[PDB]
Structure 1
Amino acid sequence: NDDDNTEIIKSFKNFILEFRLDSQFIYRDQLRNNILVKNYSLTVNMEHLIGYNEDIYKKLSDEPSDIIPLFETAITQVAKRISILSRASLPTFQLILNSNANQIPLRDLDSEHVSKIVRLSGIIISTSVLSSRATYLSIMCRNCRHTTSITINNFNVSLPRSCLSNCGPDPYIIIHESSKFIDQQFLKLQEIPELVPVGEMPRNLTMTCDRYLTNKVIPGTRVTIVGIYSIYNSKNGVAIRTPYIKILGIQSFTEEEEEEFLQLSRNPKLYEILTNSIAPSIFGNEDIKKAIVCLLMGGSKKILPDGMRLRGDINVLLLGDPGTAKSQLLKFVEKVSPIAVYTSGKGSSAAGLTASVQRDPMTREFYLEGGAMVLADGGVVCIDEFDKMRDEDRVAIHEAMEQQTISIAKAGITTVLNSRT
């Protein structure tokens, strides 16, 4: 079937080389421009792949785990053909997908979607540290030192069971100098809160991304994911499998919003406009709204010659009578502020506020996970009904609120976290 794979590869090569709209070869341009800035990926809109030849899209969507590596390979070959004079070295290019297929909500994904390309959305609630996955393994036999290699496509390999021509039962080892690796990151996606069924607890998926999709999102961001709904046999029922998504695309200043915000800065009535625009259904409380605008913007953070650093963040306490719209103002600020977290004082614990220990079900090893203050870093933590908070929690607020740090010594993990809040 290698001739058939070669014809798939040549079909994709022709798609890169031939696809054109309104006199522009958009994917030749995008691939060249991506090479110039030294990001080795290509973002493909599958509307265009469908429009070019739907047979290719049918092959892709029938079995993406086999077809995606061939498309990546085709991109590498075209990349060389449009950036190197051959007869006078680049890595395996990442494919990135844009799509407008109808979204499957995160709760409805089940066994009939296994290995299909899927489009969904949710809130990223955690983002693991980066990790190294192999693309090319250089391999050696422990006894005879017969060397071979594994070239890997990360869509789901293992070391060979015995020597490929006594030589021992299980003999192969990796040569870590010649082997090539890539960045891999794990994310947890929670379903959109306004899509949760009545009385249900919100459900979530573990999911993975690599190369130029790592570090592209932070916790709390609302995203649409394109990826392969897929399976792996975890260590922790019977004949059961853990579901996960292999991400193929993410969607979450522009050169004219630059102009819009210059024009809005130039408006003389700006402060009144923003003041009116805070919680517009709440009548009155004019000075409080003005102060909320100040808290949103913040002062200016500073560093002195000594290395000492000075707070830019403003803290505001609204203490007062019932039904004065305090909670309504906090629940508005959690909407408008670009980073924000909302908690209530009686819902809190010191751990869930500063940071907590976790044991990752995937590695099965410890890692530290951020609480509300960390998730609010760079923005506002809205602590509603703050007077109901326990004393130890209010103690735990002090470092994160004034020193703007959290110092940690838990499970042997000594650590200090930042809390610009």
Structure 2
Amino acid sequence: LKDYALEKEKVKKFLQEFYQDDELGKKQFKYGNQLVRLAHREQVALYVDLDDVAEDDPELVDSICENARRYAKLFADAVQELLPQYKEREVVNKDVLDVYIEHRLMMEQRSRRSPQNQYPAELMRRFELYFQGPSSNKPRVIREVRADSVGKLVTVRGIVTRVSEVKPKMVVATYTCDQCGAETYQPIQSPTFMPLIMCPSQECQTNRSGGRLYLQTRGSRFIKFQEMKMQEHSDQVPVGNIPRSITVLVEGENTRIAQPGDHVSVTGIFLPILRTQGLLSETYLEAHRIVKMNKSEDTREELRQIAEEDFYEKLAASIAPEIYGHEDVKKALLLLLVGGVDQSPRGMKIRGNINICLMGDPGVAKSQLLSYIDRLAPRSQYTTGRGSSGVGLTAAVLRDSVSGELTLEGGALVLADQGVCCIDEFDKMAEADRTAIHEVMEQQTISIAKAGILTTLNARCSILAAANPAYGRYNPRRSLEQNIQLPAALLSRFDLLWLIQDRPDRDNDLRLAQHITYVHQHSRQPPSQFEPLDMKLMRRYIAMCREKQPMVPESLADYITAAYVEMRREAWASKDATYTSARTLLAILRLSTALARLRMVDVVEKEDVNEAIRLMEMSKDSL
């Protein structure tokens, strides 16, 4: 539609003698310095912020957005043509590519029209160009990127689920013959290419020479390559679906930036892949910019209710409304819901590990409450204990069609990166998997004695476990070595243990009947005038609370020490199946840590600490 020469001249003038208002509205050759650095081979990747263009060239930005690859190539050629005028001296031959390039330029000059008698543009680059998505286009959700946006520069958010090791990919393939003496170039764009056999060079075909060609890796151009799969953020996926994955390919200096399980912002060109009725093709994303979130590291005044309104009576009372009671049990969930993302800047890495255990699955249908835990909590991902077999963590051999050689993958634990981990049906796990859990308990010490796999898994989420009872409710008459069937030492490592017995408590038994009767009566599941409210309001208020970062006082710990003393007498006299130890002191300080976040005073706080002690006493010795 439009002449590419005019646009090339426009971008050249834009870069060379056209000005911006970045530094106090004064031109300072912003891109000029980077171009100079490129001339001296001191900067390898060049980024073109589309925002800078959009400040004073909206039509160019619109054209670029409507078609990405063509303008990308045009900019690359323009930068190539800008280089020679910034040459000041002789290249110091940094690498093999520079040496080959300077010999090629010397040979070109020595002997100085067929369109096929010149160096390909990509071979003489020594620079890579990329685009940063303009802020004008709002980020899109992966499910909404359909075939209709092919070829348009889009930006999507997600979480890395499968990244391969860095490997070299070949852009220009160099072939040399023993008769011609010249260099034959085959640019390669598809992931697969066909090596040449008989050179189609005009010299040989005219001379009917042997034309035997030998591929070499000396003067070929190589670029970095990676393969990653990215999955939608669980927080915004509709409840009625599951997140979908879209393939992203990253090349050049942009590599080695994404880490597994991390939130990434990706901007690239949506292009099809051929694998060679009708013409079918797949899709991928050639990224141009990967920026992680900063959070991955480590108007009246009446609009808030922080100190005047108690968080216990409003926040807790709107959590898990389908559950028929267990308000004391409900409180611990809030501590689990809080977790240990908010930690003091003092190196307390253990604070974020809250491995709570629940025994008894048929009890009061507590399997349901897991979903509410994932949905309300931010930075939380839904996971299932029984989502795959034991092969899901190690490596095995299965048939595949699309891709995957020497597959390396993780389980549910790795999938939730520093979030909320949900594990169901602990009993049905095989013996080997149980050891895999136990090695997680030892603070990320996953050792594998298999020849091919020697990885070190990084488990930093919060682990919630639900366990079925031993083929029936516990019976007191059974003494030790029989009463508990799951290994006791395994339970010992867990910080909190909860078990619910459906005792014939006629006072409580009537309460269950009353609530199930009000079902099928109206649409208000929480009849105590609690409205479900929008999820937007709750999340926004919670986020600003993280920024305060209160710190508990160390002096108060002296009070706690007495609690261990009285516990010892009970532990020795009871001789019960459950047993505790100094781990309670380990737990208590962590447990007290979260509770104080409601009252951000931290000068004198006694009730908050005491309640955590009272929580332990309520569950044990219920008789």
Give the alignment partner of residue 66 of structure 1, picking from 63, 70, 79: 70
C-alpha separation between the residues in 2 aligned to 1:420 and 1:135? Answer: 35
Q: 2:15 maps to which residue? A: 16
Q: 1:31 maps to which residue? A: 34
Contact 1:64 1:228 in 2 (8 A): yes
The change in CA–CA distance for 1:290 and 1:25 in structure 2 (over 3 A counts) is: same
Q: 1:40 maps to which residue? A: 44
Deviation (angstroms), 1:167: 4.6
C-alpha separation between the residues in 1 aligned to 2:37 and 2:400? Answer: 35
Deviations 1:132-156 (A, max 9, x none): 1224433213664442335667999
Q: 1:366 maps to which residue? A: 406
Contact 1:76 1:91 in 2 (8 A): no
AA aligned to 2:175 is I
Q: TM-score, normalised by structure 2?
A: 0.50
> SS at 1:52's partner residue?
coil
Q: 2:168 maps to which residue? A: 132
> SS at 2:143's partner residue?
coil
Q: Given the alignment of the two structures, is residue 281 of structure 1 paired with residue 280 of structure 2, yes or no?
A: no
Q: Given the alignment of the two structures, is residue 382 of structure 1 paired with residue 421 of structure 2, yes or no?
A: yes
> SS at 1:188's partner residue?
strand
Deviations 1:66-86 (A, max 9, x none): 32122124335556766x535
Contact 1:341 1:380 in 2 (8 A): yes
> SS at 2:407's partner residue?
strand
Unpaired stretches in structure 2, ≥5 consecutive residues: 92-97, 99-124, 299-306, 318-327, 460-623
Q: 1:308 maps to which residue? A: none
Greater mean alpha carbon deviation, residues 110-119 or residues 26-35:
26-35
Deviations 1:172-219 (A, max 9, x none): 443211212110111212234455466444332212111122122223
Give the alignment partner of residue 227 of structure 2, picking from 177, 186, 189: 186
Deviation (angstroms), 1:231: 0.9
AA aligned to 1:319 is L
The change in CA–CA distance for 1:26 and 1:384 in structure 2 (over 3 A counts) is: farther
Q: 1:228 maps to which residue? A: 269
Q: 1:319 maps to which residue? A: 358
Q: 2:601 maps to which residue? A: none
Deviation (angstroms), 1:62: 4.8
Q: Given the alignment of the two structures, is residue 414 of structure 1 paired with residue 452 of structure 2, yes or no?
A: yes
The change in CA–CA distance for 1:398 and 1:418 in structure 2 (over 3 A counts) is: same
Over the aligned positions, Cα root-mean-square deviation in angstroms equals 4.9
Identity of aligned residues (%): 21
Deviation (angstroms), 1:20: 0.7
Deviation (angstroms), 1:418: 0.8
C-alpha separation between the residues in 1 aligned to 2:372 and 2:230? Answer: 28
C-alpha separation between the residues in 1 aligned to 2:37 and 2:371? Answer: 46
Q: Given the alignment of the two structures, is residue 163 of structure 1 paired with residue 167 of structure 2, yes or no?
A: no
Q: 2:436 maps to which residue? A: 396
> SS at 1:415's partner residue?
coil
C-alpha separation between the residues in 2 aligned to 1:5 and 1:224? Answer: 31
Deviation (angstroms), 1:414: 0.7
Contact 1:16 1:75 in 2 (8 A): no
Q: 1:85 maps to which residue? A: 88
Contact 1:357 1:369 in 2 (8 A): no
C-alpha separation between the residues in 2 aligned to 1:328 and 1:197? Answer: 13
Deviation (angstroms), 1:50: 3.6
Deviations 1:254-296 (A, max 9, x none): 8xxx9xx9xxxxxxxxxxx9xx999x93477489839976687
Deviation (angstroms), 1:247: 1.6
Deviations 1:6-50 (A, max 9, x none): 654443232233241121447427726976995422332324324
Residues 242-391 of structure 1: matches in 2 within 5 Å?
Answer: 242-252=282-292, 281-282=315-316, 285=331, 289=335, 297=343, 314=353, 316-319=355-358, 327=370, 331=374, 335=378, 343-353=383-393, 365-375=405-415, 379=418, 382-385=421-424, 387=426, 389-391=428-430
The change in CA–CA distance for 1:62 and 1:287 in structure 2 (over 3 A counts) is: closer
C-alpha separation between the residues in 2 aligned to 1:247 and 1:103? Answer: 14
C-alpha separation between the residues in 2 aligned to 1:97 and 1:364? Answer: 30
The change in CA–CA distance for 1:281 and 1:67 in structure 2 (over 3 A counts) is: same
Give the alignment partner of residue 157 of structure 2, picking from 121, 140, 153: 121
The change in CA–CA distance for 1:92 and 1:14 in structure 2 (over 3 A counts) is: same
AA aligned to 1:179 is S
> SS at 1:281's partner residue?
helix
The change in CA–CA distance for 1:300 and 1:391 in structure 2 (over 3 A counts) is: farther
Structure with greater Cα Rg: 2
Contact 1:159 1:172 in 2 (8 A): no
Greater mean alpha carbon deviation, residues 381-390 or residues 324-333:
324-333
Q: 2:260 maps to which residue? A: 219
Contact 1:227 1:245 in 2 (8 A): yes
C-alpha separation between the residues in 2 aligned to 1:119 and 1:364? Answer: 26
As a proportion of its length, which structure holds more strand? 1
Give the alignment partner of residue 101 of structure 1, picking from 105, 125, 137: 137
C-alpha separation between the residues in 1 aligned to 2:26 and 2:145? Answer: 40
Greater mean alpha carbon deviation, residues 117-126 or residues 188-197:
188-197
AA aligned to 2:149 is H
Contact 1:71 1:95 in 2 (8 A): no
Contact 2:45 2:129 in 1 (8 A): yes
> SS at 1:107's partner residue?
helix
C-alpha separation between the residues in 2 aligned to 1:134 and 1:42? Answer: 20
AA aligned to 1:92 is F
Unpaired stretches in structure 1, ≥5 consecutive residues: 262-272, 303-310
AA aligned to 2:230 is L
Deviation (angstroms), 1:241: 0.9
C-alpha separation between the residues in 2 aligned to 1:13 and 1:143? Answer: 42
C-alpha separation between the residues in 2 aligned to 1:61 and 1:159? Answer: 35
Contact 1:140 1:147 in 2 (8 A): yes
Deviation (angstroms), 1:404: 1.8
Q: 1:307 maps to which residue? A: none
Greater mean alpha carbon deviation, residues 209-218 or residues 368-377:
368-377
The change in CA–CA distance for 1:85 and 1:145 in structure 2 (over 3 A counts) is: closer
> SS at 2:20's partner residue?
coil
Greater mean alpha carbon deviation, residues 154-163 or residues 241-250:
154-163
Deviation (angstroms), 1:107: 2.7
C-alpha separation between the residues in 2 aligned to 1:110 and 1:329? Answer: 31
C-alpha separation between the residues in 2 aligned to 1:386 and 1:240? Answer: 42
AA aligned to 1:241 is S
